[PDB]
Design a protein around this ligand. Structure first.
Ligand SMILES: Nc1ncnc2c1ncn2[C@@H]1O[C@H](COP(=O)(O)OP(=O)(O)O)[C@@H](O)[C@H]1O
Ligand SMILES: Nc1ncnc2c1ncn2[C@@H]1O[C@H](COP(=O)(O)OP(=O)(O)O)[C@@H](O)[C@H]1O
Lengths: 276, 274
């Protein structure tokens, strides 16, 4: 049958490792028809790599959503969304569409590493996106914010956060451990409301991992669209991103992206799956 | 070795078949590191499919170029560029970069007339003399050459000569549906020899993004080390498969399948000196 239509709602990462660029790249690697409704353009200073976020006007955001809704996505992913207004609209486009899958990557920006910048966006994601999400994909910080637990440091903490987030309406929860968990291996925790699954790969180099989160969530969405269950989709996504990470490369002294095409071009990576 | 970094200077096609979307998708298919400096956003009315083109401000355009230049592209493609100002800056950024390859897709909208011939003039002045490859369709080639309507391979040879002499190192004029409908003929010229490139003419219903995809593939193939002639032949094969495997999105548009070459099938290109 036809390619599945997969929409991301996200900003442009000019460096092209994260943002909508990671999304579209990943959708393409996974044999789906990628689409984007652009929210903002992120650029980087040539000397410091300091970010500058330029919002797109709401009129143009809405016109893009109108076109995408008309086309009719089979699955929708949200990336980093910067305002309450866009968060609310993203949930509404999903609800208006005939998409069967909604993957929410609840991206938050930090003022420390234990302090959120812009707590209002967290409340808006809880209010508008969690109750709609097929899969929500917080990192360890984000999971602590969504759950209200604060700092999480263990699989047991992640289980508690997943329970809470599920109870807030997300159908499936994957709490990424990854670098933030800082163990010998890379652990994530998947929950479906009944069983907790720990997903494990090797922990690869950490220097060039830009776009890992976006890519994981994008892969999850494409795998869902192509007919994997949420559990299978997150397992497959972890393999996909792990290869991308292993094969990350140095862009400059400030960043290096994952290699989105590594899973297909270079190597598959094994994922261990255990009940916890 | 490292992925080649390939930048497109292009707008967003919200429908995702053409524009920067086709470019990034094609770059990815061809095992390069795709990047975009966005010039504009094109949206379509849900009921009539009427297009609205929203230019992006020059300040955000410049911020993107600074980032992309810092990264350091190995190859740059230009897509549909809306203003003489942008056309000029695109050539400048190529020269400022260490990129070895510049692929200019001289996209025009036919309104033997364009909306603003000043854009054609700016392409001639600022882009053609920097281009490794320029990739006009039959209409665009008439405009760039000053010949108007082209009807034949012979006309295409004249237009290719004129465009080459305006300073493009290599010229491929796409005939496609405009020229004939039993086969899809293109004319490649390197200043020395004229080559006709041929595939079968495939379905014509769902061909959205074909031109962008062709120029994007040319760019990636040059970045990955194919000569200009081999790059354009490979690009024609790549897009031929994408066209053959095109599909209906809605009543208004049917995109090419950018991944068809690698996932579905290759298509051989017949090459003959003419
Ligand atoms: N260096 C690494 N090696 C292996 N897996 C990793 C690594 N970094 C992250 N991951 C995995 O990549 C995915 C994305 O992780 P995420 O936590 O979103 O990235 P970040 O560290 O930016 O927050 C998760 O599946 C996570 O386990
Ligand atoms: N229906 C078709 N069958 C086979 N090849 C085609 C078809 N339509 C276009 N082509 C080829 O696709 C490429 C892009 O052509 P074209 O669509 O003329 O560019 P443009 O969109 O800029 O008009 C060329 O190599 C052309 O020969």
């Amino acid at each position: 049958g036809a390619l599945k239509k997969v929409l991301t709602i996200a900003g442009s990462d000019t460096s092209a490792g994260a943002g909508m660029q990671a999304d579209l790249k990943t959708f393409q690697e996974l044999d789906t028809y990628g689409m984007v409704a652009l929210t903002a353009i992120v650029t980087m200073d040539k000397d410091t790599w300091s970010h500058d976020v330029t919002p797109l006007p709401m009129d143009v955001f809405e016109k893009q959503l109108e076109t995408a809704l008309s086309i009719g996505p089979d699955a929708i992913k949200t990336g980093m969304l910067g305002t309450e207004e866009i968060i609310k609209r993203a949930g509404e486009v999903y609800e208006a569409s005939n998409a069967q899958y909604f993957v929410v990557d609840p991206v938050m920006v930090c003022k420390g590493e234990d302090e959120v910048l812009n707590p209002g966006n967290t409340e808006a994601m809880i209010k508008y996106l969690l109750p709609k999400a097929t899969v929500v994909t917080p990192n360890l910080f984000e999971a602590g914010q969504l759950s209200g637990l604060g700092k999480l440091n263990s699989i047991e903490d992640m289980k508690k956060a997943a329970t809470i987030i599920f109870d807030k309406g997300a159908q499936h929860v994957i709490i990424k451990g990854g670098k933030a968990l800082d163990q010998d291996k890379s652990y994530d925790l998947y929950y479906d409301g009944q069983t907790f699954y720990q997903l494990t790969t090797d922990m690869f180099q950490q220097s060039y991992n830009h776009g890992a989160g976006c890519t994981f969530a994008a892969a999850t969405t494409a795998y869902l669209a192509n007919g994997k269950s949420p559990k299978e989709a997150v397992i497959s996504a972890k393999a996909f991103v792990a290869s991308a990470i292993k094969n990350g490369w140095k862009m400059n002294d400030f960043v290096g992206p994952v290699d989105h095409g590594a899973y297909n071009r270079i190597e598959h990576i094994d994922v261990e799956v255990t009940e916890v």
